[PDB]
């Protein structure tokens with residue numbers, strides 16, 4: 001129940017932990033892949049691990065269109 | 068060939084024009100819907116129309132993770 | 135349970151509805167005020183109205199520091 | 202005098218330096234905590250340190266609403 | 269003294285007002301042009317108009333690279 | 336042909352690699368400089384290095400105005 005209109009369910013297929021940030025790669029419907037860069041603290045708090053089923057969220061104003 | 072690593076192909080299923088901004092809704096693999104808000108100038112220049120085959124692009128640092 | 139680390143509870147003190155976007159102003163702790171621009175559809179779906187108690191959410195990478 | 206309408210004064214209560222990025226945590230009115238991830242270069246240039254009195258700035262189009 | 273590392277001085281050559289947002293177009297050094305979409309209220313508050321000399325500011329995390 | 340209206344051609348004058356992110360600094364027309372923080376993987380994938388000619392891309396909704 002958040003304003004961000006793009007909510008994409010997926011499964012974790014990759015995780016890389018940096019000093020401040022962390023990279024999460026999710027496989028969503030149709031084989032598409034979504035890549036997320038978040039704080040390292042969050043990775044630790046949401047129990048992010050390979051195989052976990054999670055949801056990618058994006059604000060509409062952050063989505064560009066390519067023709 | 069742009070750094071934004073998230074590229075999701077889709078078809079236009081919704082279009083609403085504002086004074087400065089415009090809203091484009093794309094249907095992607097699995098019926099998921101991606102909503103984008105961009106400049107009105109761009110819709111016009113990219114010739115966005117119902118049925119067009121376009122692509123949604125998102126920077127990794129804009130993707131959040133939900134548990 | 136989302137990665138975005140900034141979650142600020144507040145009360146709606148202002149709402150302006152545009153064609154594509156909408157502006158929401160919330161009063162949070164200490165009298166601070168937060169201003170949000172979201173899609174008009176969201177305003178309609180989350181039942182946004184003056185007096186409503188809601189939460190402002192922000193990704194860490196979108197926060198700048200001013201000295 | 203910048204368009205970002207959200208300006209929240211606070212004191213530094215956390216600082217973690219990465220190779221490229223850095224994390225700053227500010228305590229604002231009510232003990233709320235704001236977390237910011239910026240360039241390592243900037244922390245150094247703005248002389249960010251525990252106890253400093255700084256200000257968090259956020260563009261309105263980056264603030265989401267949660268119900 | 270804001271952490272955002274991109275500060276581009278320029279002159280207003282275009283200004284379009286919408287209901288909630290506004291579009292500002294600046295001509296910057298060297299023949300380049302920058303386009304910004306911000307809140308209508310900020311435009312009104314900073315007294316933006318054709319001919320004004322202002323600065324465009326962008327967070328490093330929001331700049332993409334294209335090859 | 337991406338909707339992002341800001342496309343600034345430039346040359347790489349600085350490149351710093353971190354664990355998850357990377358910092359690219361470009362010199363653009365007219366003596367201006369642009370700094371970008373993107374994923375380390377994209378840098379590696381687009382083969383970014385000192386001297387390369389590339390383009391910085393920014394969404395209009397991410398450009399702030401300072402008076």
Ligand code: MOO
Nearest residue numbers: 003004005060173
């Ligand atoms: O209504 Mo949003 O937060 O622009 O997706």
Ligand code: MOO
Nearest residue numbers: 021221222355356
């Ligand atoms: O070590 Mo970083 O600056 O979190 O990629």
Ligand code: MOO
Nearest residue numbers: 071072127373374
């Ligand atoms: O390499 Mo990006 O531009 O953070 O997706």
Ligand code: MOO
Nearest residue numbers: 039137138139194
């Ligand atoms: O960068 Mo975060 O961990 O989505 O607030």
Ligand code: MOO
Nearest residue numbers: 087088155288289
């Ligand atoms: O009428 Mo708007 O301000 O382009 O949604």
Ligand code: MOO
Nearest residue numbers: 205206261306307
């Ligand atoms: O007027 Mo803003 O820069 O969308 O907060």
Ligand code: MOO
Nearest residue numbers: 239240272273328
């Ligand atoms: O990521 Mo910055 O240091 O706000 O440009």
Ligand code: MOO
Nearest residue numbers: 105106339340395
């Ligand atoms: O808001 Mo835009 O049309 O992606 O620059």
Ligand SMILES: [Ca+2]
Nearest residue numbers: 062263396397
């Ligand atoms: Ca943004």
Ligand SMILES: [Ca+2]
Nearest residue numbers: 129196329330
């Ligand atoms: Ca952003």
